Design a binder for this molecule. Structure first.
Ligand SMILES: [Zn+2]
Length: 133
RNA sequence: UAAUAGCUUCUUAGGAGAAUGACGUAGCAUGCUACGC
């Protein structure tokens, strides 16, 4: 889309030296101790986002056993029989956090709050009915 | 640049409800006293 490739990196974490000093003053992080730091913020170079996406090379076209899958579907539907569902109106949709990204290209002009405010319920129902045809 | 969903903690604001207390007004019940018949 642009005239140059973007290489997004990942920063390292920020070290809470006060908590670490307090912990080691209490006898933590000793040699041979059972509790040791194993969870960190790992930094990434510019070739990270394209190296993770390349893992979609593990998705192969798999043809399933259809006489078996069509029975597994019935059993799974039996597993999902206690619930109820169906279409709701735009005034019945509850969004948890509206200060979230709206994806491309909509993140160039605002968050999801902008598009949930700018669209009335009428033209949200219109969009939903558009997606059914 | 920062997704979907769930749960939880904390803070603030608004409404509704409950409980207790306080004041004021109105209605009803009772006792005492003053006047008239
Ligand atoms: Zn439907």
């Amino acid at each position: 889309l642009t005239n140059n490739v973007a290489f997004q990196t990942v920063k390292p974490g920020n070290f809470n030296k006060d908590f670490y000093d307090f912990a080691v003053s209490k006898g933590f992080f000793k040699e041979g101790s059972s509790v040791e730091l194993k969870h960190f913020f790992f930094a990434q170079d510019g070739n990270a986002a394209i190296s993770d996406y390349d893992y979609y090379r593990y998705n192969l076209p798999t043809m399933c056993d259809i006489r078996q899958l069509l029975f597994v579907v019935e059993v799974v539907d039996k597993y999902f029989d206690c619930y109820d569902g169906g279409c709701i109106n735009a005034n019945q949709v509850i969004v948890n956090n509206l200060d979230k990204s709206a994806g491309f290209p909509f993140n160039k002009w605002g968050k999801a709050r902008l598009y949930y405010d700018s669209m009335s319920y009428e033209d949200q129902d219109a969009l939903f009915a558009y997606t059914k045809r």
